[PDB]
Amino acid sequence: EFKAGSAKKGATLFKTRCLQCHTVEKGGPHKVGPNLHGIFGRHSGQAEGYSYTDANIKKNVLWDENNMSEYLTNPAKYIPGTKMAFGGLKKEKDRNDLITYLKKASE
Numbered sequence: 611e612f613k614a615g616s617a618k619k620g621a622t623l624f625k626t627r628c629l630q631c632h633t634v635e636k637g638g639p640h641k642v643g644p645n646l647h648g649i650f651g652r653h654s655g656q657a658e659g660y661s662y663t664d665a666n667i668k669k670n671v672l673w674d675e676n677n678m679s680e681y682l683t684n685p686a687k688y689i690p691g692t693k694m695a696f697g698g699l700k701k702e703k704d705r706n707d708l709i710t711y712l713k714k715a716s717e
């Protein structure tokens with residue numbers, strides 16, 4: 611259950627845990643994983659110009675703060691077969707902080 615946290619702390623988490631694989635700016639490149647602009651309020655597997663695993667598309671989840679928190683804890687548990695699956699963001703406070711940042715940065 612997402613609770614708004616610190617966008618400042620979330621930005622640092624994004625830099626150290628996500629940026630190696632993702633950009634978030636509008637128009638940013640799909641460097642490894644997809645650019646994340648517009649991710650909230652959108653179905654999984656829909657970024658224009660990115661070939662996802664079929665698994666990520668067929669999960670058929672419409673992203674919100676709560677299901678993204680579950681996903682980020684362990685992506686392969688939520689979407690079996692997802693590619694380049696990172697290790698997960700384990701602490702609830704860290705997920706809350708990251709999602710607080712990502713909601714802003716991705717809009």
Ligand code: HEC
Nearest residue numbers: 627628631642643654655656657662663666692693694696
């Ligand atoms: C590379 C080793 C990654 C790290 C580190 C993180 N992510 Fe990731 N992400 C990666 C890939 C290759 C993909 C696509 C997977 C597929 O099976 O096709 C993803 C996907 C996501 C998604 C879903 C995107 C969508 O449905 O359009 C999100 C929301 C996401 N990633 C977020 C995210 C965040 C916030 C990270 C750090 C905590 C993180 N990613 C790390 C590859 C990699």
